[PDB]
Design a protein around this ligand. Structure first.
Ligand SMILES: Nc1cccc(-c2cnco2)c1
Ligand SMILES: Nc1cccc(-c2cnco2)c1
Ligand SMILES: Nc1cccc(-c2cnco2)c1
Length: 338
């Protein structure tokens, strides 16, 4: 009953914000630009500092014209409407949002510990306890999101930031969607795609549970289970029903992974009648105190090294490009709701 009442309150609070989204809660000239933290085909993430409070934030800047060209309009509207409505310990918090003639802006809490991607590659692989600590946080986060009829659709190490306490905060909701029944978009990252995405089916939250299997494998092995030079070669491996495990994996880990990396979505853990509890009650999670993880009372395996809330050392160096704002409004109609 404890979990039922928690999730009922979570949905109440989400729906109130979902139905009346915040808009236009800051503007660009309230911030100083510090450094580029990441960059992609239609946006970037910047470290900024608020000029009055001195607080640091990670500002995601999306170019409206490039969003349109790359068919991401609805996805960007999803990202912001979802982020302004959710509230969970392992999700990066959206602090402000606004738009201008050229760009969309989402101003997020700044997490100086960096992406799990870097730490995983630097350390090689995580021990099973270390992987399990992160996996438990993802299990709880997906339980939360799925209860709101959301699908995340971009689980991978680059999207998991490590905070000052060593806990995960999930970033980048660019593919997240509130799904009415099932959905169809081909999106995600190739190595993490579930078979039903590759096969152009209408799919559901089971794709997130598949991706969790990929993530756990990658954390514990150091490399993902399905990889190749060309996407079609990755996709052939994904749909095949075959996966090889390192001999250092425990039997319990292999068993869990066979049930998450189940090609038949109707048999996949997380998508059965017992839902998330098939995962939470699996032997691989026997040592996990789910409440203590939620309450952030477990000592983390690893605390990132950083010098203070403005340190960028855990992020890498990118060419520093202009943040230009056109004198004319672009794509106003498309982004009305943002
Ligand atoms: N997605 C993405 C990329 C690079 C940095 C960040 C970041 C840092 N603190 C909060 O978000 C987020
Ligand atoms: N308002 C809105 C928009 C998109 C999806 C949904 C949705 C999905 N399941 C229940 O409601 C609701
Ligand atoms: N994403 C999407 C597409 C079409 C209809 C809906 C929807 C939500 N509530 C009723 O319909 C949501």
């Amino acid at each position: 009953e404890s979990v039922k009442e928690f999730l009922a309150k979570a949905k109440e609070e989400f729906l109130k914000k979902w139905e009346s989204p915040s808009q236009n809660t800051a503007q660009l000239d309230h911030f100083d630009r510090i450094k580029t933290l990441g960059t992609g085909s239609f946006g970037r993430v910047m470290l900024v500092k608020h000029k009055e409070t001195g607080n640091h934030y990670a500002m995601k800047i999306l170019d409206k014209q490039k969003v349109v060209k790359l068919k991401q309009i609805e996805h960007t509207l999803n990202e912001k409407r979802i982020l302004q409505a959710v509230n969970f310990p392992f999700l990066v918090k959206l602090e402000f949002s606004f738009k201008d003639n050229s760009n969309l802006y989402m101003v997020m809490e700044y997490v100086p510990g960096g992406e799990m991607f870097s730490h995983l590659r630097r350390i090689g692989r995580f021990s099973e306890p270390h992987a399990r600590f992160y996996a438990a946080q993802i299990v709880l986060t997906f339980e939360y999101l799925h209860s709101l009829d959301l699908i995340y659709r971009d689980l991978k190490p680059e999207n998991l930031l490590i905070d000052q306490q060593g806990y995960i905060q999930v970033t980048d909701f660019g593919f997240a969607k509130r799904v009415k029944g099932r959905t169809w978009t081909l999106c995600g990252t190739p190595e993490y795609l579930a078979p039903e995405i590759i096969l152009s089916k209408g799919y559901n939250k089971a794709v997130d549970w598949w991706a969790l299997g990929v993530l756990i494998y990658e954390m514990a092995a150091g490399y993902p289970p399905f990889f190749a030079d060309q996407p079609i070669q990755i996709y052939e491996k994904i749909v095949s029903g075959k996966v090889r495990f390192p001999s250092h994996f425990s039997s319990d880990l292999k068993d869990l992974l066979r049930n998450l990396l189940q090609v038949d979505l109707t048999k996949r853990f997380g998508n059965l009648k017992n839902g998330v509890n098939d995962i939470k009650n699996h032997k691989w999670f026997a040592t996990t105190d789910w409440i203590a993880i939620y309450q952030r009372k477990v000592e983390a395996p690893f605390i990132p090294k950083f010098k203070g809330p403005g340190d960028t050392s855990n992020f890498d160096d990118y060419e520093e490009e202009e943040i230009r704002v056109s004198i004319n409004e672009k794509c106003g109609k498309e982004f009305t709701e943002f």
